């Protein structure tokens, strides 16, 4: 996976 998709996953996860 593009590491920026991972950065986008971390961003949404933090909203928890």
């Amino acid at each position: 996976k593009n590491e920026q998709e991972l950065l986008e996953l971390d961003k949404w996860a933090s909203l928890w």
Partner: antibody
Amino acid sequence: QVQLVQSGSELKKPGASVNISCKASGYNFTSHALNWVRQAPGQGLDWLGWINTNTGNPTYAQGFTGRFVFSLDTSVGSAYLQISSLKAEDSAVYFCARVRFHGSGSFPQPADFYYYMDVWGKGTTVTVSS
Amino acid sequence: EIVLTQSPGTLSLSPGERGTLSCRASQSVRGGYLAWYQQKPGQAPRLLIYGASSRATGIPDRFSGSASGTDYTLTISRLEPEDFAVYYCQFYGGSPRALTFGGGTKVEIKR
């Protein structure tokens, strides 16, 4: 040999616009996000946000969601930061920086992943004065 | 937002001395993605340490990091003349994710 080349210094009047560029070299522009960091004269670093070089989607820091716009041009492997309705407070050095986000595990988290800016552009001075 | 307190703003040490810079966070430091940066006059910031203690490529071996509880620490085992500079800690974290920098610590030559 990884390098970010930023455009030259800019002199603008209050209310004008500026558009600064940052062109990648020695790496795939779309493989790494780019952060935009401002440093006002005699002040510390301020994160303006980041641009996903794979999708073009911009994330703006809390205080820069209005007059600041991040854009892309993957053809020239370059990213852009446009400030609108400039204010003397916008007077600062604007830096482009390659984000590195990697680690171990299915999901990224601070215990297993690293976030850091390894390559920085030399900076683009923007002086806003009437 | 998380606030990273770097104290003192000015750290006075002699060249050759061992230097430790503190980044004290308003919450647990390892709950974010950490890094130390160095900035010299007229230059871009330069990455030194990422995470708690991983040394970036090309960075001298005198630089090391440690993090426990609310304290993130950069150690310079022997200050060289080019090490007198401003140092910024980083915390990328928080619920609205945010890249937070400390206010910066200038390491100045004590004479």
